[PDB]
Design an enzyme around this catalytic site. Structure first.
Site, PDB file in Angstrom:
ATOM      1  N   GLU B 370      43.883  25.999   4.449  1.00 17.28           N
ATOM      2  CA  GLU B 370      44.204  24.376   4.390  1.00 17.28           C
ATOM      3  C   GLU B 370      43.212  23.946   4.230  1.00 17.28           C
ATOM      4  O   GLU B 370      43.293  22.147   3.480  1.00 17.28           O
ATOM      5  CB  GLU B 370      44.976  24.610   5.575  1.00 17.28           C
ATOM      6  CG  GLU B 370      45.747  23.014   5.516  1.00 17.28           C
ATOM      7  CD  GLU B 370      44.678  22.110   6.424  1.00 17.28           C
ATOM      8  OE1 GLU B 370      43.849  22.866   6.502  1.00 17.28           O
ATOM      9  OE2 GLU B 370      44.996  20.868   6.613  1.00 17.28           O
ATOM     10  N   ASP B 610      75.326  20.107   2.793  1.00 16.77           N
ATOM     11  CA  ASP B 610      74.785  19.736   1.314  1.00 16.77           C
ATOM     12  C   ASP B 610      74.299  18.715   0.973  1.00 16.77           C
ATOM     13  O   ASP B 610      73.637  18.152   0.956  1.00 16.77           O
ATOM     14  CB  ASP B 610      75.331  20.420   0.235  1.00 16.77           C
ATOM     15  CG  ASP B 610      75.388  21.500   0.254  1.00 16.77           C
ATOM     16  OD1 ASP B 610      74.402  22.765   0.880  1.00 16.77           O
ATOM     17  OD2 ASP B 610      75.573  22.661  -0.759  1.00 16.77           O
ATOM     18  N   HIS B 633      57.778  11.054  -3.832  1.00 19.12           N
ATOM     19  CA  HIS B 633      58.610  10.881  -3.035  1.00 19.12           C
ATOM     20  C   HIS B 633      58.763   9.133  -3.508  1.00 19.12           C
ATOM     21  O   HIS B 633      57.638   8.505  -3.505  1.00 19.12           O
ATOM     22  CB  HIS B 633      58.341  11.492  -1.726  1.00 19.12           C
ATOM     23  CG  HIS B 633      59.490  10.779  -0.746  1.00 19.12           C
ATOM     24  ND1 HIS B 633      60.097   9.847  -0.465  1.00 19.12           N
ATOM     25  CD2 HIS B 633      60.172  11.639  -0.383  1.00 19.12           C
ATOM     26  CE1 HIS B 633      61.010   9.098   0.354  1.00 19.12           C
ATOM     27  NE2 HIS B 633      61.245  11.309   0.463  1.00 19.12           N
TER      28      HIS B 633
HETATM   29  O1  LIG Z   1      42.628  18.105   1.947  1.00 19.14           O
HETATM   30  C1  LIG Z   1      43.334  17.983   2.852  1.00 19.14           C
HETATM   31  O2  LIG Z   1      44.012  16.978   2.449  1.00 19.14           O
HETATM   32  C2  LIG Z   1      43.088  17.747   4.785  1.00 19.14           C
HETATM   33  C3  LIG Z   1      42.192  18.938   4.841  1.00 19.14           C
HETATM   34  C4  LIG Z   1      41.952  19.093   6.205  1.00 19.14           C
HETATM   35  N1  LIG Z   1      43.192  18.504   7.456  1.00 19.14           N
HETATM   36  P1  LIG Z   1      43.310  19.254   9.070  1.00 19.14           P
HETATM   37  O3  LIG Z   1      41.423  18.337   9.526  1.00 19.14           O
HETATM   38  O4  LIG Z   1      43.391  19.782   9.033  1.00 19.14           O
HETATM   39  O5  LIG Z   1      43.340  18.277   9.724  1.00 19.14           O
HETATM   40  C5  LIG Z   1      43.530  16.236   9.252  1.00 19.14           C
HETATM   41  C6  LIG Z   1      42.462  15.823  10.662  1.00 19.14           C
HETATM   42  C7  LIG Z   1      42.606  13.838  10.595  1.00 19.14           C
HETATM   43  C8  LIG Z   1      41.876  13.841  10.856  1.00 19.14           C
HETATM   44  C9  LIG Z   1      41.939  13.828  12.944  1.00 19.14           C
HETATM   45  C10 LIG Z   1      42.877  12.792  13.304  1.00 19.14           C
HETATM   46  C11 LIG Z   1      43.314  12.613  14.367  1.00 19.14           C
HETATM   47  C12 LIG Z   1      43.412  13.368  15.148  1.00 19.14           C
HETATM   48  C13 LIG Z   1      42.318  14.721  14.906  1.00 19.14           C
HETATM   49  C14 LIG Z   1      41.979  14.749  13.567  1.00 19.14           C
HETATM   50  C15 LIG Z   1      41.194  17.874   6.572  1.00 19.14           C
HETATM   51  O6  LIG Z   1      41.378  16.263   7.078  1.00 19.14           O
HETATM   52  O7  LIG Z   1      39.429  17.929   6.164  1.00 19.14           O
HETATM   53 ZN   LIG Z   2      43.798  21.633  10.418  1.00 23.74          ZN
HETATM   54 ZN   LIG Z   3      41.189  20.172   9.887  1.00 25.14          ZN
END
Ligand SMILES: O=C(O)CC[C@H](NP(=O)(O)OCCCCc1ccccc1)C(=O)O
Ligand SMILES: [Zn+2]
Ligand SMILES: [Zn+2]
Ligand SMILES: *[C@@H]1O[C@H](CO)[C@@H](O[C@@H]2O[C@H](CO)[C@@H](O[C@@H]3O[C@H](CO)[C@@H](O)[C@H](O[C@H]4O[C@H](CO)[C@@H](O)[C@H](O)[C@@H]4O)[C@@H]3O)[C@H](O)[C@H]2NC(C)=O)[C@H](O)[C@H]1NC(C)=O
Ligand SMILES: *[C@@H]1O[C@H](CO)[C@@H](O[C@@H]2O[C@H](CO)[C@@H](O[C@@H]3O[C@H](CO)[C@@H](O)[C@H](O[C@H]4O[C@H](CO)[C@@H](O)[C@H](O)[C@@H]4O)[C@@H]3O)[C@H](O)[C@H]2NC(C)=O)[C@H](O)[C@H]1NC(C)=O
Ligand SMILES: *[C@@H]1O[C@H](CO)[C@@H](O[C@@H]2O[C@H](CO)[C@@H](O[C@@H]3O[C@H](CO)[C@@H](O)[C@H](O)[C@@H]3O)[C@H](O)[C@H]2NC(C)=O)[C@H](O)[C@H]1NC(C)=O
Ligand SMILES: *[C@@H]1O[C@H](CO)[C@@H](O[C@@H]2O[C@H](CO)[C@@H](O[C@@H]3O[C@H](CO)[C@@H](O)[C@H](O)[C@@H]3O)[C@H](O)[C@H]2NC(C)=O)[C@H](O)[C@H]1NC(C)=O
Ligand SMILES: *[C@@H]1O[C@H](CO[C@@H]2O[C@@H](C)[C@@H](O)[C@@H](O)[C@@H]2O)[C@@H](O[C@@H]2O[C@H](CO)[C@@H](O)[C@H](O)[C@H]2NC(C)=O)[C@H](O)[C@H]1NC(C)=O
Ligand SMILES: *[C@@H]1O[C@H](CO[C@@H]2O[C@@H](C)[C@@H](O)[C@@H](O)[C@@H]2O)[C@@H](O[C@@H]2O[C@H](CO)[C@@H](O)[C@H](O)[C@H]2NC(C)=O)[C@H](O)[C@H]1NC(C)=O
Ligand SMILES: *[C@@H]1O[C@H](CO[C@@H]2O[C@@H](C)[C@@H](O)[C@@H](O)[C@@H]2O)[C@@H](O[C@@H]2O[C@H](CO)[C@@H](O)[C@H](O)[C@H]2NC(C)=O)[C@H](O)[C@H]1NC(C)=O
Ligand SMILES: *[C@@H]1O[C@H](CO[C@@H]2O[C@@H](C)[C@@H](O)[C@@H](O)[C@@H]2O)[C@@H](O[C@@H]2O[C@H](CO)[C@@H](O)[C@H](O)[C@H]2NC(C)=O)[C@H](O)[C@H]1NC(C)=O
Ligand SMILES: *[C@@H]1O[C@H](CO)[C@@H](O[C@@H]2O[C@H](CO)[C@@H](O)[C@H](O)[C@H]2NC(C)=O)[C@H](O)[C@H]1NC(C)=O
Ligand SMILES: *[C@@H]1O[C@H](CO)[C@@H](O[C@@H]2O[C@H](CO)[C@@H](O)[C@H](O)[C@H]2NC(C)=O)[C@H](O)[C@H]1NC(C)=O
Ligand SMILES: O=C(O)CC[C@H](NP(=O)(O)OCCCCc1ccccc1)C(=O)O
Ligand SMILES: *[C@@H]1O[C@H](CO)[C@@H](O)[C@H](O)[C@H]1NC(C)=O
Ligand SMILES: *[C@@H]1O[C@H](CO)[C@@H](O)[C@H](O)[C@H]1NC(C)=O
Ligand SMILES: *[C@@H]1O[C@H](CO)[C@@H](O)[C@H](O)[C@H]1NC(C)=O
Ligand SMILES: *[C@@H]1O[C@H](CO)[C@@H](O)[C@H](O)[C@H]1NC(C)=O
Ligand SMILES: [Ca+2]
Ligand SMILES: [Ca+2]
Ligand SMILES: [Cl-]
Ligand SMILES: [Cl-]
Ligand SMILES: [Zn+2]
Ligand SMILES: [Zn+2]
Lengths: 694, 694
Positions: B370, B610, B633
């Site tokens: 992810e 559905d 979307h």
């Molecule tokens: O590549 C992507 O689209 C996202 C990958 C990755 N997602 P992830 O770190 O698991 O979650 C996004 C968190 C956004 C920053 C945040 C904001 C509020 C509380 C905690 C963290 C990132 O934002 O680096």
């Molecule tokens: Zn995460």
């Molecule tokens: Zn992360």
């Protein structure tokens, strides 16, 4: 009892005859008042007949018409600029119709305006291989020339596309007696052959499934945003006009330059069939001049949509549709089909009035503007795509019921093969010499399968008719059936009087089907298919028949690639993944069939009916085929060289086509490998929809 | 009895704590052996717990790693080319972990290699409006400069995109204490603040929903055809590296050129925050030099997919998914979510062992990679898109369960609003001062709705997490819930220790949730939602809540357009069709709701279920949004300026954005009108899926 036999017995040849007469007394050109009045009449009669709801769905789409006060024609001019020969301004009307108004004169719909003047080059059928022969083998350059091509073999829009890419500045299409005059039969009105003044109308668009040229993707409703004409889909960039063979002879007889390369380039007129460019010595200073003044115009069109609500599964739709608009009287195309649809609706309505309803919903459609590019069916499907996606069981088309009287001709998805075999074994043959035998028996004898003893031929769907959006864009199982001629090499050319003023009620009643027994047989086949699809408890689709054909198509595409063994070694081109996917599909389909035969549980039944219904849908790739976003089915697409013909594994086929001529072989073979991957993935993904769901 | 209360009561804070400990003792970076071993462990335990099937789904995708023997760093160099200051090669490890191996040093994943040397420009948060201010108002040219930007406010990939389009030759990202150091709290290990040597890792791709950069549209399986790196999706073209605020201060302290334009550009360090370009007089000849040597490498990743087969509708899937890969220990992100998923699976499995099964199938997913761009969830959804299209009821995400301990934070489709309200009224609040009150009560008090008295705030989904492919590409109703901080302006910035080596089990256990009561509350909300979606007879979606929001979004987009009244007059820009469609949707939704309450007939029920299930699906446009084919979307998309934020009517929003700066207003306003048409059509088409089916 209310069963299929009750439905079928209610169908009457005499009613079909009465309806055909009623639909063919005046022209019903798309966008005209006469065709709107016919739409209102059909709406009224379908309500009378017993349908639950019958509505008109209207759209405002780009159509094309000649200018009534500035006619189209072609000339031979001399050096002084005098026009020494002119082509006809209209077809001599048939007996008793010489005073009918509003017969559109022959023209090529969507031709731009222009008056190009130049030397002629004769390009045979203007097929891809005809242009290859001219340009690669004969070294003839079509750039800035007027091309003259005979109709036949491929869709006329492909000819125009090919002429445009060759650099032509105009195209003249004509009907050669070799293709439109059967030896030993009289011309109209004394027989069914094309007279020398007859002319085939028809559109020359290359829409690739887009529908209205101004609104690709979205219905042309009252608030639609339209592209400007310069960004419209599919319009030709050079003027085009069709003529008959009396006029063609006057244009061809003076041709000089090179001899035809072989006898396959020579038609039946008494001319040399010289390729040109230009005329022989004495006439070398004369030129050909086109005068085209047609206009494209946004015009309202009307589909009639009738609903017979299902008793048990009203959210599952079986659709019977065919078009209503004609070029002139439409005696065969489309009213021989529309009269059959009308009698089918009447028959279903008779059962409804006695208290019966089909298990699933049946929709009946009278489509408008088919002749200008499948416009009515495509705009309606764009408007209703979400309902069709999720609820569409099958689409049965119903254009011309006869194009001959020799035998049945069926094109459909493999999912329908078993249904068609079973139904035709229960219907009576109408053929002379087969009295008391089944239609399956006569059809199988006259049109044997090339690969299976004791089976009939069933072809692939391409395009050129209203099933295209349902099958190639949305992935709804589709089929069609009609009576046809023996004439194999003319299978894409049309019967002689196709799109001419001579295609009348009298043509049909005197020379094709005087008793209306072939029409009745086609009504039984189309109606019977609709009845079974709408009423069977288990949907009548056999996934194992798709497995058989997928292996055949994989062998076929592998065989094309294997003409290039050195390149397959160099670029590591493997079909192993595709054969693996096909093997998996075969194994999984076999297991699903066992479960289907072996499974009182309506959730399991409907779960299984959904797996059947969504199996055609699984072959759709939402990214579409390369540069053709509205052809999304990965197993079938209309041929890129001939819209009328279906091509299997079209993504790989087009990647391999003429590959030896590409100037970056690494890039070209990379694209072959990419298409093998897309095809193997889609086959495996479709297979997996038939696995146990959890 | 086996009802939701039995399920919820089985969930235990102590088990979540044990699982979190177990998941956070070593790093679990995507593509590494440690994360494959954790995948195998989870697979084994989910089987133990009682799931019907638990499989690993593997893909080979493009990942990025630093070079272990050639470290990344930034220098200040002098005119002689001596490096007089170097940034850190690693974060000082936390107490007791100073001997843990395989901690990836801070880097920006997917940065290209390079050693660009130049003058610095400080660009604040590198947002679109920060670059507008620099280039339009301050007349500072970023071309060929190294940009330094503070993390915060928007996704870091957007900052890099913006710097690239401004002409920068490199980007330095840093954590400013203004955004990552809460006043009055100690830094780690003595509190939850970021120390000056801490650094936020993270990818800087701009994939727009594509998934693996080499295989857009198709799963990266064993025979996949991969794009070459030069054609890959989303990779940045300039080197990028993140640093902590001790190193940032050394780079910023010498900055000269222009003063910051206002106080919103000044962080908390003791530096002027001059924008540059370059350093003040005495140091004008020194430059900044980046040294980036990371490599992109195709690497295997593994998702764990567990199935609990439905008793009645096994072909309807409710999916609970969250990721397993972390940058380092993943104490909050993602293992606080993964530990919650593990306890939910254990609880459902306890009921299964007693003979219970849910009505519909529940799928549980532990997604890989992810952190490198949603790769694992997106490749799996590409592989299974046909099954998900036709069978997917809902997706509940399960990333970090806490990012604070103040109140609940829910983002979801309007179809889930009523379900979330109803469930939170039945759950106990874990908050101090609300003992004996409902979670709905505490949540509503701490996070009131901006438009409705006595309701809580629920936000729009954007992206930046694994629900993106299910919601924005495939149109499956999606939702997420977690505990969050009070800090509103930091809502997209992350908690202070986000993606740092300091985000450990001890961080959570000492400073966030010592009793694990917030984790347990989040498990109840996520598990409770899954339980209701999987077991309710009628799906728990309320279409009338979509009607309410669609009106709000239409008013909002109309209000943006109405800042340009002259152009709306000139180009005849009408929102009438969109309001008409929204009015129709409201009317039809009301009627459908009446039928739903008013309808023993399982075909009518499933027909209606559905219609509920396919309602989110109806907002998908198969042609995608402009230049973003995987965001399909029409009502929601990730903001083009900030992947983390959702935007409503994104097609129209992007058409209107900065329109006053476009050099062909006729063309730009034509595109606004085209997007209004697409939006009005899609709203009406979605409405029509809720009409009577026949
Ligand atoms: O590549 C992507 O689209 C996202 C990958 C990755 N997602 P992830 O770190 O698991 O979650 C996004 C968190 C956004 C920053 C945040 C904001 C509020 C509380 C905690 C963290 C990132 O934002 O680096
Ligand atoms: Zn995460
Ligand atoms: Zn992360
Ligand atoms: C048709 O259905 C069959 C199932 O009956 C399906 O078989 C699957 O094929 C793939 C590819 O051959 C198998 O993938 C392997 O999976 C194992 C782990 O299970 C991996 O270790 C393998 O990778 C190693 O070996 C590769 C090949 O030499 C190397 O390139 C790689 O670097 C690794 O060293 C490999 O990924 C998969 O296990 C089976 N699944 C089964 C048998 O259940 C087949 O793919 C289907 N056909 C299509 C077109 O989908
Ligand atoms: C919301 O739902 C309503 C239904 O309650 C739906 O109303 C439909 O609106 C369209 C457009 O306003 C109507 O279209 C008209 O249809 C008649 C024939 O029925 C035509 O004659 C009209 O065309 C004439 O007038 C036009 C406008 O001045 C001219 O441009 C044109 O050239 C013609 O002279 C027009 O096409 C339609 O009848 C109703 N349907 C009903 C009431 O059942 C509305 O469209 C829905 N909103 C959205 C966004 O879909
Ligand atoms: C076209 O007609 C053929 C011939 O009738 C149909 O095939 C037949 O289908 C029936 C019903 O599924 C099969 O009967 C089954 O027999 C098995 C024993 O193996 C039993 O387990 C089931 O309970 C059931 O009685 C029959 O075998 C089969 N005959 C064949 C394949 O030769 C076919 O389904 C029809 N096609 C359609 C409706 O699309
Ligand atoms: C969230 O909880 C609310 C409150 O319970 C649910 O709304 C309620 O839903 C029930 C069942 O559909 C409604 O009962 C119905 O009453 C009508 C009388 O008008 C009757 O005809 C039906 O037979 C049925 O008894 C009730 O009116 C309704 N209450 C409201 C809207 O205040 C709601 O459905 C829940 N949301 C979910 C499950 O997503
Ligand atoms: C359709 O053609 C008419 C008529 O064309 C005229 O008559 C022809 C035989 C030929 O001589 C043409 O060159 C003539 O113009 C068009 O009507 C004319 O339009 C022009 C300018 O637009 C006008 O000044 C003339 O008076 C019109 N002439 C007549 C006889 O009515 C008309 O434009 C065309 N319709 C279209 C393009 O939709
Ligand atoms: C071939 O036709 C041209 C043009 O004729 C005009 O347009 C036709 C569609 C038709 O409607 C005719 O009645 C029109 O006159 C003829 O050339 C014209 O001849 C007239 C009268 O002699 C002259 O005044 C015009 O200037 C000519 N127009 C042009 C464009 O040259 C021509 O004579 C016809 N040729 C033959 C062999 O019949
Ligand atoms: C990862 O980096 C290694 C090591 O880089 C070397 O040591 C650094 C400190 C610096 O001095 C570099 O310039 C050095 O090259 C790379 O291994 C080297 O590769 C080259 C040519 O490819 C080879 O001739 C050297 O002997 C290698 N040096 C050592 C010390 O092993 C390696 O290429 C990089 N890995 C990648 C790019 O995946
Ligand atoms: C900043 O670092 C440079 C480079 O140091 C090398 O790479 C680092 C990642 C680290 O692994 C060091 O141990 C490596 O030596 C230093 O400049 C180098 O200094 C050495 C020894 O004096 C010299 O032989 C190299 O040629 C230099 N390399 C370069 C690229 O200039 C530099 O001294 C460090 N600066 C400070 C202030 O510490
Ligand atoms: C085709 O058949 C229809 C239906 O019988 C005819 O239309 C009817 O004509 C009668 C007499 O003019 C009217 O009283 C009815 O109102 C019409 N019914 C409709 C339109 O539903 C029509 O005349 C026939 N057309 C031709 C050319 O024969
Ligand atoms: C996390 O918990 C798992 C499951 O209890 C531990 O893995 C087990 O370890 C024991 C003792 O080494 C083995 O006998 C089992 O085979 C393992 N079970 C599995 C993998 O399913 C693991 O040790 C724990 N990890 C940490 C870091 O505490
Ligand atoms: O625009 C399209 O795609 C097709 C429009 C239109 N379809 P239509 O004339 O109704 O049917 C195609 C018939 C193909 C020629 C043919 C071949 C055999 C027997 C009869 C006719 C056309 O081909 O001109
Ligand atoms: C055909 O003719 C034109 C010159 O009039 C030229 O531009 C074009 O390149 C020619 N093509 C070939 C293949 O000779
Ligand atoms: C129809 O069949 C008849 C007699 O069976 C045959 O003579 C005639 O040519 C056929 N008509 C056509 C159009 O093929
Ligand atoms: C920025 O700098 C470069 C010159 O080094 C130039 O090409 C570019 O046009 C400049 N842009 C502006 C807006 O001044
Ligand atoms: C958690 O809540 C406590 C006590 O209620 C508070 O002091 C602490 O700062 C909170 N932790 C975080 C990380 O916000
Ligand atoms: Ca359209
Ligand atoms: Ca992919
Ligand atoms: Cl047909
Ligand atoms: Cl989440
Ligand atoms: Zn037709
Ligand atoms: Zn036709």
């Amino acid at each position: 009892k209310h069963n299929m036999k009750a439905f079928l017995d209610e169908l009457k040849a005499e009613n079909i005859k009465k309806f055909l007469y009623n639909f063919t007394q005046i022209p019903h050109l798309a966008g005209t008042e006469q065709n709107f009045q016919l739409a209102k009449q059909i709406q009224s009669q379908w309500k009378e007949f017993g349908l639950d709801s019958v509505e008109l769905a209207h759209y405002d789409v780009l159509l094309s018409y000649p200018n009534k006060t500035h006619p189209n024609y072609i000339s031979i001019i001399n050096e002084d600029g005098n026009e020494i020969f002119n082509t006809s301004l209209f077809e001599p009307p048939p007996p008793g119709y010489e005073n009918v108004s509003d017969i559109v004169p022959p023209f090529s719909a969507f031709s731009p305006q222009g008056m190009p003047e130049g030397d002629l080059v004769y390009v045979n059928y203007a097929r891809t291989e005809d242009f290859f022969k001219l340009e690669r083998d004969m070294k003839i350059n079509c750039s800035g020339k007027i091309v003259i091509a005979r109709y036949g073999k491929v869709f006329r829009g492909n000819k125009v596309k090919n002429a445009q890419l060759a650099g032509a500045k105009g195209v003249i299409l004509y009907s050669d007696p070799a293709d439109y005059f059967a030896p030993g039969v009289k011309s109209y009105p004394d027989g069914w052959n094309l007279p020398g003044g007859g002319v085939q109308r028809g559109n020359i668009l290359n829409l690739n499934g887009a529908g209205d040229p101004l609104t690709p993707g979205y219905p042309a409703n009252e608030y639609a945003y339209r592209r400007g004409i310069a960004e419209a889909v599919g319009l030709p960039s050079i003027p085009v006009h069709p003529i008959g063979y009396y006029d063609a002879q006057k244009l061809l007889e003076k041709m000089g330059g090179s001899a035809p390369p072989d006898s396959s380039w020579r038609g039946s007129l008494k001319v040399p069939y010289n390729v040109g460019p230009g005329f022989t010595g004495n006439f070398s200073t004369q030129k050909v001049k086109m005068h085209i003044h047609s206009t494209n115009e946004v015009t309202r069109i009307y589909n009639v949509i009738g609903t017979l609500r299902g008793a048990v599964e009203p959210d599952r739709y079986v659709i019977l549709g065919g078009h209503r608009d004609s070029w002139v009287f439409g005696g065969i195309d489309p009213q021989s089909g529309a009269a059959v649809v009308h009698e089918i609706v009447r028959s279903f309505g008779t059962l409804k009035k006695e208290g019966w309803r089909p298990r699933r919903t049946i929709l009946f459609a009278s489509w408008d503007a088919e002749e200008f590019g499948l416009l009515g069916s495509t705009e309606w499907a764009e408007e209703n795509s979400r309902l069709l996606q999720e609820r569409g069981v099958a689409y049965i088309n119903a254009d011309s019921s006869i194009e001959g009287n020799y035998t049945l001709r069926v094109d459909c998805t493999p999912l329908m093969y078993s249904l068609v075999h079973n139904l035709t074994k229960e219907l009576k043959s109408p053929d002379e010499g087969f009295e008391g035998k089944s239609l399956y028996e006569s059809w199988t004898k006259k049109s044997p399968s090339p690969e299976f003893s004791g089976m009939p031929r069933i072809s692939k769907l391409g395009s050129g008719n209203d099933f295209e959006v349902f099958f190639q864009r949305l992935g709804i199982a589709s089929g069609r059936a009609r009576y046809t001629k023996n004439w194999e090499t003319n299978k894409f050319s049309g019967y002689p009087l196709y799109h001419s003023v001579y295609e009348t009620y009298e043509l049909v009643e005197k020379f094709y089907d005087p008793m209306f027994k072939y029409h009745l047989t086609v009504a039984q086949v189309r109606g019977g298919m609709v009845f079974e699809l709408a009423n069977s408890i288990v949907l009548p689709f056999d996934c194992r028949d798709y497995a058989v054909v997928l292996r055949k198509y994989a062998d076929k595409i592998y065989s094309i690639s294997m003409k290039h063994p050195q390149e397959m070694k160099t670029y590591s081109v493997s079909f192993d993944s595709l054969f693996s996917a096909v093997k998996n599909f075969t194994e999984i389909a076999s297991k699903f069939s066992e479960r289907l035969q072996d499974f009182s549980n309506p959730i399991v039944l409907r779960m299984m009916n959904d797996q059947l219904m969504f199996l055609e849908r699984a072959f759709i790739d939402p990214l579409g085929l390369p540069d053709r976003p509205f052809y999304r089915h990965v197993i079938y697409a209309p041929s890129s060289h001939n819209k009328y013909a279906g091509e299997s594994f079209p993504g790989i086929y087009d990647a391999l086509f003429d590959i030896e001529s590409k100037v970056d072989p690494s890039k070209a073979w990379g694209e072959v490998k990419r298409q093998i991957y897309v095809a193997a993935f889609t086959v495996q993904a479709a297979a997996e929809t038939l696995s146990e769901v959890a």
